[PDB]
Structure formats: structure tokens, C-alpha cells
Amino acid sequence: PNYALKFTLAGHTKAVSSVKFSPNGEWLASSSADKLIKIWGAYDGKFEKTISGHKLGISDVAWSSDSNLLVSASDDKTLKIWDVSSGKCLKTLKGHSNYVFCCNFNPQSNLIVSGSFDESVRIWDVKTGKCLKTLPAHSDPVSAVHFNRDGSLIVSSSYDGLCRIWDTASGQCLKTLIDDDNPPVSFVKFSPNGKYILAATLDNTLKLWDYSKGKCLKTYTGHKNEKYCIFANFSVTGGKWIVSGSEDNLVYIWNLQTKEIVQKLQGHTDVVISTACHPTENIIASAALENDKTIKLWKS
Numbered sequence: 001p002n003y004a005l006k007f008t009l010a011g012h013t014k015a016v017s018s019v020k021f022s023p024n025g026e027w028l029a030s031s032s033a034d035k036l037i038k039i040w041g042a043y044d045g046k047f048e049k050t051i052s053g054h055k056l057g058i059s060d061v062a063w064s065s066d067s068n069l070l071v072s073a074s075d076d077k078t079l080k081i082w083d084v085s086s087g088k089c090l091k092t093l094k095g096h097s098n099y100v101f102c103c104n105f106n107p108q109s110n111l112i113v114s115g116s117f118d119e120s121v122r123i124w125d126v127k128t129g130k131c132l133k134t135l136p137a138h139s140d141p142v143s144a145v146h147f148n149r150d151g152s153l154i155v156s157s158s159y160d161g162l163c164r165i166w167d168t169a170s171g172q173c174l175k176t177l178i179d180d181d182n183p184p185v186s187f188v189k190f191s192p193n194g195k196y197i198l199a200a201t202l203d204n205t206l207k208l209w210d211y212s213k214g215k216c217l218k219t220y221t222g223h224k225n226e227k228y229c230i231f232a233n234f235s236v237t238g239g240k241w242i243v244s245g246s247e248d249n250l251v252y253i254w255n256l257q258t259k260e261i262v263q264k265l266q267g268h269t270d271v272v273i274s275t276a277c278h279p280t281e282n283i284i285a286s287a288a289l290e291n292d293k294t295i296k297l298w299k300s
């Protein structure tokens with residue numbers, strides 16, 4: 001592809017931790033160590049509004065599938081659910097006993113899943129703000145959580161070096177994925193069609209799993225990732241790419257099928273912690289840590 005820098009989004013006063021496109025494609029939401037959520041135009045990069053309320057820094061944010069709600073995960077041990085158009089905090093989700101690290105809605109958006117440094121995964125009711133399940137998911141901080149395409153499954157990852165797949169409805173562990181070694185797993189998510197999971201590990205490696213057979217199918221390397229929980233992505237609006245941030249301040253793009261690096265995006269001045277792919281255009285958002293503080297929008 002030919003992604004080129006179109007906009008730089010400045011305004012967070014500390015490290016940006018996470019960026020996400022709304023499912024309707026109109027907006028970008030960003031979370032920061034500065035305790036704020038910011039909302040931006042997805043196409044023009046224009047600053048829209050700031051959403052505030054958390055008492056400590058925020059590590060993750062996610063949209064409901066109707067683009068009306070956001071959920072954020074905080075070091076203050078809570079998640080909050082926000083009505084984006086009014087800026088209202090609808091619910092505060094209490095129950096983790098350490099930093100909340102990651103969060104996501106299910107496609108129906110009646111459930112929220114969260115992962116924490118308390119080594120648990122929790123499943124919450126959106127309408128009532130109540131925790132429906134706690135899963136004893138891992139033996140170290142939970143780095144990522146994600147619903148599959150129809151909400152029936154959750155995948156979690158942890159510093160303990162495991163990916164686990166869970167049944168949403170019952171809370172039972174359906175699968176533990178483990179390879180030749182178990183370096184910390186720093187990120188995991190389902191592929192859009194639901195057949196694979198992509199997992200990143202702190203050994204500078206991304207891995208594509210066929211989780212039904214339980215086998216690693218592809219390996220992506222060349223980037224630097226030994227310390228941070230960096231988001232990765234399936235890019236599926238154009239060519240089929242894998243997109244990831246990197247601790248050498250670059251955005252990496254890989255050919256999904258052949259596994260070669262097909263583009264490296266330069267511009268950030270600190271670790272690229274988060275990338276997101278626009279749901280219908282060939283647009284990538286990337287965000288960086290404390291010495292950069294900016295979000296970049298790239299188009300192919």
C-alpha cells in the first residue's frame with residue numbers, strides 16, 4: 001500500500017495510550033495518561049471534544065457498535081461508560097482491584113469485557129453497570145480482551161504467556177493456546193471473519209493463530225516490541241495487511257499472506273503504542289507515548 005501522513009493530532013498533554021475508530025467511520029477516540037478521552041474527526045483530523053471523569057490515566061477505550069457509547073479502562077481500577085454525544089458518564093464499573101488495562105464491547109453492545117492487572121477478566125452488563133462474571137483468567141496482568149464476530153467467544157492474553165478463549169455465555173475456558181515457548185503475550189484479537197487470532201508477544205513477534213485447530217499459521221517480525229503492550233490490527237479495506245506499532249517509533253505494515261514488511265511509517269518521535277484501521281477507508285491512526293503525545297492519521 002502507500003500510506004502517507006495526512007494529519008497530526010495534537011492536544012493530549014501526556015502519553016496517548018489507545019486510539020479507536022467509531023464503527024460508523026466518522027470519529028476517532030483517543031485515551032491518554034492525562035486522564036482524558038478526546039474525540040476527533042476521522043476524515044479531517046479535526047478536534048471535536050474532550051471527555052473527562054477518570055481519576056487516573058486511561059489505558060484503553062472502545063466504541064459500542066452503534067457509535068453512541070464509549071467505554072474506557074483506567075488505572076483508577078474502574079471502567080466508565082460514556083454517552084459520546086452528551087459527554088455524560090452513564091455508568092462506572094467497579095470491581096477490579098488493580099489497574100484496568102483493556103476493554104471492549106461485544107457486537108450486540110449489551111456486554112463489556114475488561115482485563116486487569118488483578119489477573120482477572122470481567123464481563124459487565126452495559127445497561128445496569130453490574131459485573132455479570134469474573135473469570136480467573138490468568139496468573140499475571142491481563143494485557144488484552146476481545147469478543148469474536150458474534151459475541152459468543154472472548155479471547156484474553158496475559159504476561160503469563162497464555163492466550164485463552166472463553167465462552168461468553170458460561171464463562172468456561174474453551175481453549176488455552178501455547179506455542180514452543182511462552183513469552184509475555186501483550187496483545188490479542190480475533191480476525192474480522194473470526195477464523196484467526198492475532199497475538200503479539202514481547203519477543204518482537206506477531207503470530208497468526210488458527211485457534212480452532214490451535215496452531216500458529218504465520219509469524220510477523222522485524223519490528224521492535226519487548227516492553228509495551230502495543231495494539232495490532234487486521235487491515236481489510238484494501239489489501240490484506242497486518243498493522244502494528246513498534247518501540248522503534250515506526251508503524252509497521254506486513255503482507256498478511258507472505259509475511260514481508262510492505263511499509264514502515266515514519267513520523268512519530270516515541271514508541272507507537274496503538275494503531276487502528278478505519279472500518280471502510282484505507283486510513284490508519286497511530287498514537288505514541290509520552291515524548292511524542294501525538295496521533296497521526298495516514299491514508300493509502
Ligand SMILES: CC(C)[C@@H](C=O)NC(=O)c1ccc(/N=N/c2ccc(CNC(=O)[C@H](C)NC(=O)[C@H](CCCNC(=N)N)NC(=O)[C@H](C)NC(=O)[C@@H](N)CO)cc2)cc1
Nearest residue numbers: 015017032033057058059060075099101102227228229230
Ligand atoms: C528483559 C528482562 C529484564 C525481563 C525479565 O524481567 N524483563 C521484561 O520482560 C519487562 C521489563 C520491563 C517492562 N515494563 N514495561 C512498561 C513499563 C512502564 C510503562 C508505563 N506506561 C506507559 O508508558 C504508557 C503510557 N501506558 C501503557 O503502556 C499501558 C497501556 C498501553 C496500551 N493499552 C492496551 N494495550 N490495552 N498502561 C500502563 O502501563 C499502566 C497500567 N497504565 C498507564 O500508564 C495509564 N496512566 C495510561 O495508560 C509501560 C510498560 C516489561 C517487561
